[PDB]
C-alpha atoms as one frame of an Amber mdcrd trajectory, in Angstrom:
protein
 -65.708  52.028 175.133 -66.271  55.593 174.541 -66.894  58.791 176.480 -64.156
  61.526 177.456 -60.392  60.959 177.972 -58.857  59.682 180.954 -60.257  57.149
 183.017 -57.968  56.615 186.368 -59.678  53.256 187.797 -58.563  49.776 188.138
 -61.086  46.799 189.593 -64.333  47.335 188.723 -67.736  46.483 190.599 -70.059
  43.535 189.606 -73.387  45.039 187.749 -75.067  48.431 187.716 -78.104  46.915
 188.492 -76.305  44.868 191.421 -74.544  47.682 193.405 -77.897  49.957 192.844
 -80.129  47.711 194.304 -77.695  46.669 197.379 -77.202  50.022 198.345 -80.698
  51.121 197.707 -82.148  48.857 200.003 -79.928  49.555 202.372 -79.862  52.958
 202.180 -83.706  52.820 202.532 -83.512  51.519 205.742 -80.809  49.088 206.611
 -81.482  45.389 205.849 -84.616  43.934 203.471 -86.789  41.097 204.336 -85.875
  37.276 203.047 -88.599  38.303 200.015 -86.949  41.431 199.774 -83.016  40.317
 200.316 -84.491  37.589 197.594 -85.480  39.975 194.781 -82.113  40.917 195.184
 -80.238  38.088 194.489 -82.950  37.206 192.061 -82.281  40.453 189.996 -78.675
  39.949 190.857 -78.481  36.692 190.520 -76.909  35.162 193.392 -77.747  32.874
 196.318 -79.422  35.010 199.111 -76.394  34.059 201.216 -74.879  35.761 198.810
 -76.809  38.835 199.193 -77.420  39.171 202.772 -73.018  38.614 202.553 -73.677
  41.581 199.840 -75.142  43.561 202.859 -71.658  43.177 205.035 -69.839  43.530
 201.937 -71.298  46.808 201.782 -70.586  47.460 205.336 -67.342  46.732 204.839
 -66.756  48.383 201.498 -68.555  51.496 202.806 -65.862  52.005 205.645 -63.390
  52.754 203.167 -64.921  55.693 202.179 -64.408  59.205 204.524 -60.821  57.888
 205.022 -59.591  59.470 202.020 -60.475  62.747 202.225 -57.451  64.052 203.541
 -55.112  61.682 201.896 -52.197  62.113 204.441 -50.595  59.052 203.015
């Protein structure tokens, strides 16, 4: 609870550990192996269904980016 004034945000992502190594691996390439999608879930601590649903999570959540540039609304 520190750092400079003003914040503007609202809901907040999982870990900083989780959303850097989802879109790391997928950034690297585009989808990790079960070992790989494991580590994952095992440093996030999830399910591996939960990952590889991390993975079209992403692809879903990453969509709703360049669509506010312009901010016509």
């Amino acid at each position: 609870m520190s750092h400079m004034l003003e914040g503007r945000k609202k809901r907040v992502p999982y870990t900083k550990v989780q959303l850097k190594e989802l879109e790391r691996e997928y950034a690297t390439n585009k989808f990790i192996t079960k070992d790989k999608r494991r580590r994952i879930s095992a440093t996030t601590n999830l399910s591996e269904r939960q990952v590889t649903i991390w993975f079209q999570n992403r692809r879903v959540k990453e969509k709703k980016v360049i669509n506010k540039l312009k901010t016509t609304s």
